[PDB]
Amino acid sequence: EGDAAKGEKEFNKCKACHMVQAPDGTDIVKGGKTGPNLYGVVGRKIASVEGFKYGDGILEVAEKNPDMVWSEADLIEYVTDPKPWLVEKTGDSAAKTKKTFKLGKNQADVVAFLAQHSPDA
Numbered sequence: 001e002g003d004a005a006k007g008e009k010e011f012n013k014c015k016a017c018h019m020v021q022a023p024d025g026t027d028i029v030k031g032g033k034t035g036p037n038l039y040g041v042v043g044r045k046i047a048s049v050e051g052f053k054y055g056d057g058i059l060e061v062a063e064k065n066p067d068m069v070w071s072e073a074d075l076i077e078y079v080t081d082p083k084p085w086l087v088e089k090t091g092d093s094a095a096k097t098k099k100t101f102k103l104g105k106n107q108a109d110v111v112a113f114l115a116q117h118s119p120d121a
């Protein structure tokens with residue numbers, strides 16, 4: 001039950017590493033390249049952005065669950081605390097992650113913002 005307008009503001013915490021760019025090249029949120037493009041992330045297969053070098057943990061999630069896509073519930077959990085999410089999904093206490101950034105509040109709002117820019121979900 002997120003507020004996409006509030007999520008757009010919270011996304012300032014994400015944009016250091018993530019852009020939101022449409023397939024025609026249009027920049028919705030200009031941001032960094034340390035993490036993958038988040039345009040269309042809602043409903044997207046886990047760890048499937050072409051050309052991005054993902055960590056072993058999240059690829060294992062994708063490998064072990066080939067039909068898994070990002071749902072709003074899962075995105076909320078992952079953005080709250082990425083590492084334990086990977087541990088939960090892989091069953092591997094040593095799951096490797098390229099990021100540990102945690103968002104403690106307004107997670108549903110950020111996910112609402114991302115859903116807004118996943119129009120074909």
Ligand code: HEC
Nearest residue numbers: 013014017034035036046047054055058097098099101103
């Ligand atoms: C602000 C709260 C956010 C949000 C909403 C997301 N991130 Fe990141 N991210 C970063 C890196 C290096 C990765 C790859 C992870 C790995 O390979 O282990 C990610 C991954 C994601 C995802 C998954 C994307 C996919 O294609 O499956 C999502 C949904 C996501 N992030 C959202 C890097 C960073 C940061 C650099 C320090 C920061 C800050 C954030 N991310 C913050 C956010």
